C-alpha cells in the first residue's frame, strides 16, 4: 500500500541500470505496470495514488503525455470508471511484445525481491499483461 512506491522504485531501477540489449524490452513493460500500479491505488488509498502518480508519471510524458494528463482528474473509484483512459486499461490485458530472456530476466528478478514488492508487480503482470513472447 504504502510500499507501491518502492516496488516500483526498486523496479524501475533495475531497468535503468540493466544492459543496453535489454533496457528497450523493459522500458515497455515500464508504462503498463505503472498505470496498473496506479488504478490500484486509487481504489485503496487516493493520497498515495496521487504521490506515486506524480513521481513516476514524468518517466513517461515522450510517448504517453496524452494519457497520463487525462488521469490526473482520476482521485476515486468513481473517477475511475468515469475516465475513457482509466477504462480502456481496466477492461483488456494490455499487449506487449518481448523475448523470452528478458520477461525471464524480469520475472527472476521481482522474484529474488518478493519482499520489497516483487509479488505485487508480478501479480500485475500475470492478470493485467498480455506478453507475447518472442
Known amino acids: 500500500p ?67 494528463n487525462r488521469l490526473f482528474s482520476v482521485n476515486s473509484i468513481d473517477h475511475i470508471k468515469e475516465n475513457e483512459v482509466a477504462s480502456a486499461f481496466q477492461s483488456h490485458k494490455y499487449r506487449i511484445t518481448m523475448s523470452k530472456t528478458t520477461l525471464n530476466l524480469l520475472l527472476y528478478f521481482l522474484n529474488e525481491n518478493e519482499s520489497i514488492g516483487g509479488s505485487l508487480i508480478i501479480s500485475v503482470i500475470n492478470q493485467h499483461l498480455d506478453p507475447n513472447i518472442v
Request: zero cysteines; a neutral charge.
Open 2 to 68: 504504502e510500499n507501491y512506491i518502492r516496488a516500483y522504485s526498486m523496479l524501475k531501477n533495475w531497468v535503468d541500470s540493466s544492459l543496453e540489449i535489454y533496457k528497450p524490452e523493459l522500458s515497455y513493460i515500464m508504462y503498463p505496470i505503472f498505470i496498473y500500479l496506479f488504478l490500484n491505488l486509487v481504489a485503496k488509498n487516493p493520497v498515495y495514488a496521487r504521490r506515486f502518480f506524480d513521481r513516476f508519471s514524468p518517466d513517461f510524458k515522450d510517448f504517453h503525455g496524452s494519457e497520463i
